[PDB]
Design a protein around this nucleic acid. Structure first.
Length: 33
DNA sequence: TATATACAGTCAGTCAGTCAGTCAGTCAGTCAGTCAGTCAGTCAGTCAAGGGAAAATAAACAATACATAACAAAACATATAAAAACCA
């Protein structure tokens, strides 16, 4: 029923992440080398 | 001889004339107060130049307005993979 007011389909979205490394150890002691 | 009645005389009051003051009603000067033309002096209406600042002109020179080209910035909008919830 809805209509998008303007289309982007030839987009090529890149599979790249927004979570930095700062948020996959969660502590100073929690980090490997 | 004396007393009572009437008539005529006599004073006084009343009646009429004499003359010397007096005031109302006019006559009228005169004196003063108020109305007519000349002129001479007053006074504003009117017919003309001309003074002079505004208006117009001109020329060299300066400042502002207008239309637009280029762009900056903020609101409105979508898409999809990715986090993080979030169902189950």
């Amino acid at each position: 029923p809805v209509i998008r007011k303007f289309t982007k389909k030839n987009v090529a979205r890149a599979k790249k992440k927004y979570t930095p490394f700062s948020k996959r150890f969660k502590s100073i002691a929690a980090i490997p080398d």
